[PDB]
UniProtKB/Swiss-Prot annotation, chains A, B:
Compartments where located: Secreted
GO CC annotation: extracellular region
Keywords: Cell wall biogenesis/degradation, Competence, Hydrolase, Repeat, Secreted, Sporulation
Cited function: Autolysins are involved in some important biological processes such as cell separation, cell-wall turnover, competence for genetic transformation, formation of the flagella and sporulation. Autolysin strictly depends on the presence of choline-containing cell walls for activity.
Family to which this protein belongs: Belongs to the N-acetylmuramoyl-L-alanine amidase 2 family.
One biological process term in Gene Ontology: establishment of competence for transformation
Cell wall-binding repeats (start-end): 5-24, 26-46, 47-66, 67-86, 89-110
Name of this chain's protein: Autolysin
From-to range in the entire protein, with total length: 192 to 318 of 318
The species this protein was found in: Streptococcus pneumoniae serotype 4 (strain ATCC BAA-334 / TIGR4)
Amino acid sequence: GSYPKDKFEKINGTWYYFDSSGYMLADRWRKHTDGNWYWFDNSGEMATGWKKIADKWYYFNEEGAMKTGWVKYKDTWYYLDAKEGAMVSNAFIQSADGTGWYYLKPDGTLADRPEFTVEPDGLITVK
Amino acid sequence: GSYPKDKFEKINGTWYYFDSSGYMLADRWRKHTDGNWYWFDNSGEMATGWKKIADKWYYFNEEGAMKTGWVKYKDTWYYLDAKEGAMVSNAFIQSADGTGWYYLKPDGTLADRPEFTVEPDGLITVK
Ligand SMILES: CCCCCCCCCC[N+](C)(C)[O-]
Ligand SMILES: CCCCCCCCCC[N+](C)(C)[O-]
Ligand SMILES: C[N+](C)(C)CCO
Ligand SMILES: C[N+](C)(C)CCO
Ligand SMILES: C[N+](C)(C)CCO
Ligand SMILES: C[N+](C)(C)CCO
Ligand SMILES: C[N+](C)(C)CCO
């Protein structure tokens, strides 16, 4: 009624989330009742789009839900850890059919045309 | 001690282990006070070298201690998971100097001469 508690609330046209004492969360994560994780920056505003928390990138949809799995941002694929959420970079992510792998460049972007180089001991270098 | 209670035992040549309850260990793992993981087959014999436990491969030093990381067996390189100790297969383990990767074949052997096929979308197939 007069004391928002553990809930979302759109104040002044901005989404915030109040703890059990009526304070807005700030620089904190909150797993909502819908199953999604949400993040609120220093001003307490619900994160939308890309945000870098504790030196790891995460992608939230327009509704504020942190996404996981493959997503396409500006027509270029990315991969967010299926469990933790963070953007995977410089890694090979197994395809769904388990047939192959996809390589995400050092900057998280997918390599549609990866170039490999092999050294006599087998060390594979990608580019 | 009038009866062995939880400890090793070098019965002439071979080592064995009895639980606190007195009984001997067989077909059971045991993380000791040395941090090292140990295993004893159905005849309580302390594993040494290579062993296929529950359909997975592991390697212990000449002292029953389970080791992890790269290990060689007859001109062939294998990688042992640093957490489970199990043999990794059809996986890319990153080099220690971060410059590149080593691909292990499904059969668990290192691919020193890997061959790659990059599909239109960027899918990568390894041989
Ligand atoms: C419901 C909030 C409980 C706070 C603990 C948040 C721990 C960080 C884990 C969240 N996450 C995996 C998405 O990064
Ligand atoms: C009793 C209310 C049940 C809570 C459901 C609240 C709707 C989800 C919040 C929408 N959102 C902040 C994510 O945009
Ligand atoms: C580097 N990122 C792609 C994560 C930021 C886009 O604004
Ligand atoms: C796979 N190798 C054994 C060649 C690399 C460890 O140095
Ligand atoms: C042979 N032992 C395993 C008992 C010695 C290792 O410290
Ligand atoms: C397979 N082990 C039990 C040895 C690993 C536990 O982390
Ligand atoms: C699996 N993906 C759809 C992300 C790759 C095709 O570009």
